[PDB]
Structures are given as structure tokens and as C-alpha cells.
Amino acid sequence: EGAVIACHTKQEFDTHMANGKDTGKLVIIDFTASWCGPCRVIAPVFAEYAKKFPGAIFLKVDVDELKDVAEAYNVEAMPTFLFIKDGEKVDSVVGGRKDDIHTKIVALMG
């Protein structure tokens, strides 16, 4: 319903990722951290993108909660936005680059 889904377990992450893959929707993951200032700044923006693009799935993964998922995706700066289509990584934005994130959503959705 145009909401950011906070994934608190790998199981939670995987079920939403599978839903995206299955339904052909773009999935955007915000790899974030509670200690991260830049993450805080971009958080409400990511939430507003979720409302703006109800046809895409917006996931939030706290890197200290899901250390294995962050590792598997090679997250090495915070925040990192990964773009997933058909289950596979297709793009990324490193840092709270508001315009770049918007541009990439619009472009990858169509």
C-alpha cells in the first residue's frame, strides 16, 4: 500500500524479494543503519518514494540487524540503495542521492 517494508529477518527479506521477482515488480532495498546520519536524512524521502511508486516494492534492511544480507550484497557505504529486477541486482545508488534514486526508479520501472 505504498509503504516501506522493514525486513527484520532474512525470512522476511526473502519472502518480499520472492514476491517482487514473481510479480515482475522492481524492488528497491535501502540498506540503512540507525547510527547513520545520512541514512536518517534520506529515510523520509525513501518513504515518500514508496507512496509515489505503489507499483514497486520498497524494502528497508538495517545492516546491523541483517549482517548476512548486507554482506551478501557487498554493502560498503551507508546508505546503499540496491535495485532488483527478476530477483537479480540491476543497479545501485551509494549515498542519499535523492534525484539519482528517483531517476533510477522511473527509468527501471519503464
Name the active-site residue from 7, 36, 42, 84: 36
> Alpha-carbon distance 27 to 88, whole Å?
10
Task: List all residues 6 or more positions away from 15 whose beta carbon is below 8 Å from its beta carbon.
Answer: none
Per the listing, cell 545501485 goes with 92
Q: If residue 72 lies in a helix (H) or strand (E), which one and from where to where?
A: helix 67-72
What cell was used for 41?
536524512
> Alpha-carbon distance 20 to 45, whole Å?
21
7 classed as catalytic: no
Per the listing, cell 514476491 goes with 19
What cell was used for 27?
524492488
Peptide bond into 79 cis (omega under 30): yes
> Alpha-carbon distance 63 to 33, whole Å?
6
What cell was used for 76?
560498503
39 classed as catalytic: yes
> Alpha-carbon distance 78 to 57, whole Å?
20
Q: Which domains does the chain have, with CATH numbers?
A: 4-110 (3.40.30.10)
Q: How far is CA 52 from CA 9, 13, 47, in A?
A: 26, 22, 9
Q: CB–CB of 40/97 below 8 Å?
A: no
